[PDB]
Amino acid sequence: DRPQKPFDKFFIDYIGPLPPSQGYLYVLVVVDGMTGFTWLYPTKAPSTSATVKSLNVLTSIAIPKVIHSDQGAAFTSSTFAEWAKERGIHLEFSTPYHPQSSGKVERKNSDIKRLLTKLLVGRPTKWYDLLPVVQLALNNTYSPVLKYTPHQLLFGIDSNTPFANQDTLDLTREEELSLLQEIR
Amino acid sequence: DRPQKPFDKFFIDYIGPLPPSQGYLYVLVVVDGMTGFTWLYPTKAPSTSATVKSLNVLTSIAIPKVIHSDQGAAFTSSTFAEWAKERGIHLEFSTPYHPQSSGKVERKNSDIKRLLTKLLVGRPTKWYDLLPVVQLALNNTYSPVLKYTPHQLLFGIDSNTPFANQDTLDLTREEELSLLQEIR
Amino acid sequence: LDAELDQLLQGHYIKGYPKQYTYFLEDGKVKVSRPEGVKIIPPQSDRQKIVLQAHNLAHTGREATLLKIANLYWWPNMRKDVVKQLGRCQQCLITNASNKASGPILRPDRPQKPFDKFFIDYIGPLPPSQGYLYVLVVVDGMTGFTWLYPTKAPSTSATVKSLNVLTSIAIPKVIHSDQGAAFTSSTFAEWAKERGIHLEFSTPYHPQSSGKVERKNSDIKRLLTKLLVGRPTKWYDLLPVVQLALNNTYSPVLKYTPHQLLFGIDSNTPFANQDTLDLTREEELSLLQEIRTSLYHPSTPPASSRSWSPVVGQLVQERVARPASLRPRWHKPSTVLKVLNPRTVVILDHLGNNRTVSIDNLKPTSHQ
Amino acid sequence: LDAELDQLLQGHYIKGYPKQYTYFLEDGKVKVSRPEGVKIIPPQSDRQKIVLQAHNLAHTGREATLLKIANLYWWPNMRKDVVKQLGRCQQCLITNASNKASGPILRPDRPQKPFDKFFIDYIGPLPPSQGYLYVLVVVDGMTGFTWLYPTKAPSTSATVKSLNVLTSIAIPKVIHSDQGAAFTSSTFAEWAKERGIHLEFSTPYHPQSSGKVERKNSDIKRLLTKLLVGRPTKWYDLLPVVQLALNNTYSPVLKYTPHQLLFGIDSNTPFANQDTLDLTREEELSLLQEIRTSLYHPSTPPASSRSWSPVVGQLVQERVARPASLRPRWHKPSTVLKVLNPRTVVILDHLGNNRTVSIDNLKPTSHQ
DNA sequence: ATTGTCATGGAATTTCGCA
DNA sequence: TGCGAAATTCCATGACA
DNA sequence: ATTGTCATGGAATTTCGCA
DNA sequence: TGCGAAATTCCATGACA
Ligand SMILES: C[C@H](O)CN1C(=O)c2c3c(c(O)c(=O)n2[C@@]12CC[C@H]1C[C@H]12)C(=O)N(Cc1ccc(F)c(Cl)c1)CC3
Ligand SMILES: C[C@H](O)CN1C(=O)c2c3c(c(O)c(=O)n2[C@@]12CC[C@H]1C[C@H]12)C(=O)N(Cc1ccc(F)c(Cl)c1)CC3
Ligand SMILES: [Mg+2]
Ligand SMILES: [Mg+2]
Ligand SMILES: [Mg+2]
Ligand SMILES: [Mg+2]
Ligand SMILES: [Mg+2]
Ligand SMILES: [Mg+2]
Ligand SMILES: [Zn+2]
Ligand SMILES: [Zn+2]
């Protein structure tokens, strides 16, 4: 059995609805299975149209052999199925109510969700501009299991933005009370 | 004493007033002394201004060492004298009431005056357009004394317009009566 | 051709397929273990589609199309099939650039006598000066003697008016001009017929053909530029000065000025040459006739390493005159009817029109 | 100097005047019978005026000015005096063309790693497509991997918006660009400082300096042209297709596509290379690190027969950027302050400004 | 159914002045 | 019968937009 | 305070298939 | 140990306006 490679499988999913930022309410998350590299795309809805518009930007850089997602409406539509067939992409779904990906991916989506929550507190309407810095953070994040960051695994070089200052990701008592204040 | 050459002496004079043709009433006549070559310029007056405007066109092709004319106002003015001094041209005048040039020139001015009179009859108001054909005629006219035409003496080649069909220059009884008819 | 591939699987030799290789079946397709790796041998009936698919990705040339195909497949003489596709891609043939230079330029013989051939052209639009915007430049081919005329437009009417003034001196045998509206009009053809003047036209969009006058345009503009340094661009009153200045300027290679070649004697201009002072005009004209025939004539330069020369029947392509944004720089292939000389050719486009063109505005169609 | 000419008339030798000639007085002027004919020897105090008068007729160079002077006069080392005048004519120095070619081009080393240097530029205006007129082209120097962005103008704002999307992947060390308004703005400098990005600028009006991106502009336009044959020029929807197409096209000289140099593996695109299938990603990245270092690098070509190379202190002249009609193509002489490399130089104009210019936009001032 | 041209100023080569 | 310097010739460069 | 680049298709050269 | 043909490499040409 052939060793795992980048572009072998992309794990897609939607984060949201989030507070409106520049008219956007959702984030489509794309994680390469092998390297753990993340691409984030803000959408106005978790629709096939928005998924297709976003993935058309990503697939202009690299095309995955397989796309993996849950049974969300946007991914199970015949339109999204037509889009994939055109690009020679095999669609793959996890069992309804039983979402499975991989240890590396499951952990990556946790960091994504946590990092987003951490920066949403204080500026919940300014996340559109933060998406580039969130991705550089995520992609220059050292992997305990592999010894290398997703940037290193994808390009085979060190980065010009090393995120050596490994932060908390957990909320401070001040951020915690400020977060529950927004929940009103 | 050095042999006679083109541009050594230009003989200038005015023909007119003639019937108005394209607003013009006079013809400034320039004859090179050596070759017998003729340049004709239509003017609206026998003035220094018109002489200078016309001779500025000729002197952009070739400058004579000497200009010869009678004591006409246009040629004796201090303005025309300033114009000549600027171009290094020596002015030369014939004695008042005693016009002298040369045999070749005196004969040339006769042919000019006659050829003009011959073509004026019938179309006295259309001479402006005929000035180019009148000059080609005059300049491609064989010289009995020199064996060559003014064109040959100036360029040292035969012309593409040989005026072999040597015409009358004298008026027909029909042209004679038609000429005296205009004199009314 | 799955029949051709069957004999191969059995183990018997087919011309083109090296016998030393191991041809097998796997995943329902004929494969071969080649040094590069294991490639699929598609049936002959499938190859055209593969080549077309590989080529169409970025409309790539020979090697770039091959390198893609070679990633998955192998078959005898792949590039022969790649080149067949490249030669049939209308998009590539009309968009790609040539990589073959034209043959060496011709150095036409200098006209023998003054007034044999005039070269005419327009300069402009220039900054407006006294309501004038253009300059009609008339160059005698033999002498290089120039006549300058300010015009309000590069029109037939302004050309006729100017030339009627010039031709009062002498009439030329031929007038050579480019294909500018002013000279290709019926009114201009009528004007020339009336005077025995033959109109000769340059191949279109090839100003090198009018080289004689073009080159004089450079000197006229260079001198006007110098005289107008730190002053408003009032060129109208300088045309006469420029004309006289240039007509009396030495050509270092000839060691004669255009005035000297035309008249055989300098007029009353500064620094007039006095060497023929003791000669009679006849002795002077005799020496001028000798000087005119012994002038230096340049020869065709060496051909570049990768030049092309036209052949009758050759598929050739004319350059689009005013190509629009994002549109091909070349016309569809044409056929060379007649080769007038190694630099001029008569072609027949797909419409059926006969066109006399310069090889500088042609490329030979690629892949035969 | 009529004193110098007096000793000569007597018959005693003066350095410069050959003794074998007969120097005399006639018409109140010193004459000499030379092979050419009898020429006037003007006093040294008159020569400058004569040279200036001869030169000023048509602002002629060395031989053409000499040939006029030689018609009337003779004096020792005439051309030495002609060249002194040519070197002082401001009109000639700023209007005349150079006749010395630049030295051979440099072939800068290829950036070592992807993201070391980006080359950016704008294409346009293009026919309007969805309200868009321009294309921002981003080329990674090492890989040649390109990113395309449709814009409504070549603005700092549209560059920043596009680059904020690109830099979500990786941040470059350097961004090389030309001196277009969009990239020289303070807003763009601020945007780069904020990200640790160093801005490197090309010498002005020298797009060869941005050669890497310029060359990619040719391929982008060539491909858009082909895809749009016989259809309206709706390029907006083709940018993604063109981007993917070119990033996956082989460079025949490298035998790699920009995608392969960036990732070391083809994605799910047609004709994907399968040679590293049995290697682990680490074995694959090890081979990629080796491929990236062994790429072909061109070398500087031979210098042309008549090239010039800059020297500190040399009087040099910068080319006028947008010369107006009938105006000089050259600026007044400048002095070479520093020679950055044989093709780049720092100059000080007559104003006193320091300018980093390409030798392609410079000519060495003539006659020292 | 026509076709490159030639001013320019350093370098290369020839000629001049003298012996 | 030859030297040093001046004079002439050679000729690549670039522009006629 | 910087610097040309590289797709293209005939030609030239090398390698392959076979002996 | 060498032949004919195929494959590969070379590289001038031209365009980024
Ligand atoms: C529609 C478009 O205007 C077409 N066009 C030209 O572009 C043009 C040129 C020239 C003309 O004389 C000229 O007439 N035209 C015309 C064609 C007929 C008339 C509409 C005008 C011209 O001289 N140049 C400069 C040039 C450039 C390179 C050279 F090698 C030489 Cl020798 C000269 C080149 C541009
Ligand atoms: C005021 C005027 O607009 C100035 N200007 C250009 O002319 C220009 C060009 C180019 C640019 O990119 C470019 O930015 N500009 C700018 C300068 C900065 C911005 C105002 C624009 C350009 O690419 N080309 C094509 C070209 C031609 C020859 C080559 F050798 C190469 Cl490598 C490319 C040459 C023209
Ligand atoms: Mg989910
Ligand atoms: Mg009288
Ligand atoms: Mg023209
Ligand atoms: Mg022209
Ligand atoms: Mg630019
Ligand atoms: Mg550019
Ligand atoms: Zn194609
Ligand atoms: Zn000057």
Kindly report the protein residue whose alpha carbon is nearest to atom 1 of ligand 2. D322
Q: Which of C15, C17, C54, C13 is nearest to C32 (CA)?
A: C17
**Phi first, then psi: what are they for C305, rounded to 5°?**
-50, -40
D248 touches chain A (CB under 8 A): no
Contacts of C84 (CB under 8 A, 6+ apart): C51, C367
Contacts of C44 (CB under 8 A, 6+ apart): C1, C4, C75
C-chain CB neighbours of D252 within 8 Å are 61, 63-64, 67
Q: Structural domain boundaries of chain A?
A: 1-184
Max alpha carbon distance in chain A (Å)? 53
Query: Which of A:137-176 have CB within 8 Å of D?
Result: 139, 151, 153-157, 159-161
Q: How many helices (H) and strands (E) does chain A have?
A: 7, 5
Judge if the beta carbon of D59 is closer than 7 A to nucleic acid strand E: yes
> CA–CA separation, C288 vs D237, rounded Å?
71
Cα of D281 to nearest chain A Cα, Å? 6
Judge if the beta carbon of D192 is closer than 7 A to nucleic acid strand G: no
Angle at D227 between CA D222 and CA D228, to 5 degrees: 95
> B1-184 falls under which CATH superfamily?
Ribonuclease H-like superfamily/Ribonuclease H (3.30.420.10)
Judge if the beta carbon of D12 is closer than 7 A to nucleic acid strand E: no
Distance C179 CA to ligand 3 centre (A): 72
Judge if the beta carbon of D101 is closer than 7 A to nucleic acid strand F: yes
**Do the beta carbons of residue C357 and residue C121 sit within 8 Å?**
no
Nearest CA in chain D to A57: D240
Does residue D211 line the site of ligand 2, with CB under 6 A? yes
Residue C178 assigned as binding residue: yes
E14 C1' – C116 CA distance, angstroms? 37
3-class state of residue C287 by DSSP? helix
Residue A69 C-alpha from the chain's centroid: 12
The method of structure determination was X-ray
Contacts of D339 (CB under 8 A, 6+ apart): D310, D311, D312, D345, D346
Resolution (A): 2.7
3-class state of residue D241 by DSSP? helix
Those nucleotides of strand G lying less than 7 Å from any protein Cβ are: 1-10, 16-18
Residue C116 assigned as binding residue: yes
Helix pair angle (A127-139, D156-166), 10° resolution = 40
Q: Do C114 and B87 touch (CB under 8 A)?
A: no
3-class state of residue C50 by DSSP? helix
Position D53, amino acid? Q
> CA–CA separation, A132 vs A123, rounded Å?
16
Angle at C181 between CA C177 and CA C183, to 5 degrees: 35
> CA–CA separation, C334 vs A141, rounded Å?
62
Distance D363 CA to ligand 7 centre (A): 24
Residue of D126, D179, D212, D214 with the most ligand 2 atoms within 8 Å of its CB, for mutation: D214
> CA–CA separation, A51 vs A49, rounded Å?
6
Cα of A159 to nearest chain D Cα, Å? 7
**Do the beta carbons of residue D29 and residue D40 sit within 8 Å?**
yes
Question: Measuring from the CA of residue C75 to each C1', which nucleotide is nearest?
Answer: H6
Kindly report the protein residue whose alpha carbon is nearest to atom 28 of ligand 1. C207
A-chain CB neighbours of D192 within 8 Å are none
For strands D174-177 and D117-123, give the pairing. Answer: parallel
Distance D121 CA to ligand 7 centre (A): 5
Question: Measuring from the CA of residue D67 to each C1', which nucleotide is nearest?
Answer: F8
Let me know if D225 is exposed, middle or buried by CB neighbors in 10 A (0-12, 13-18, 19+).
buried
Task: Identify the structural domains of chain C with CATH numbers, from first to last.
Answer: 5-97 (1.10.340.70), 98-105+304-365 (2.30.30.140), 116-249 (3.30.420.10), 250-295 (6.10.20.110)
Which among D138, D194, D263 is the top mutation candidate for probing chain A, defined by the most A β-carbons within 10 Å of its own β-carbon? D263
3-class state of residue C120 by DSSP? strand
Looking up tokens 């004459």 gives: D31
> CA–CA separation, A90 vs A100, rounded Å?
17
> CA–CA separation, D134 vs D154, rounded Å?
7
**Do the beta carbons of residue B49 and residue B75 sit within 8 Å?**
no
Q: Which of C253, C347, C359, C355 is nearest to C303 (CA)?
A: C359
Position D211, amino acid? G
Distance B14 CA to ligand 4 centre (A): 7
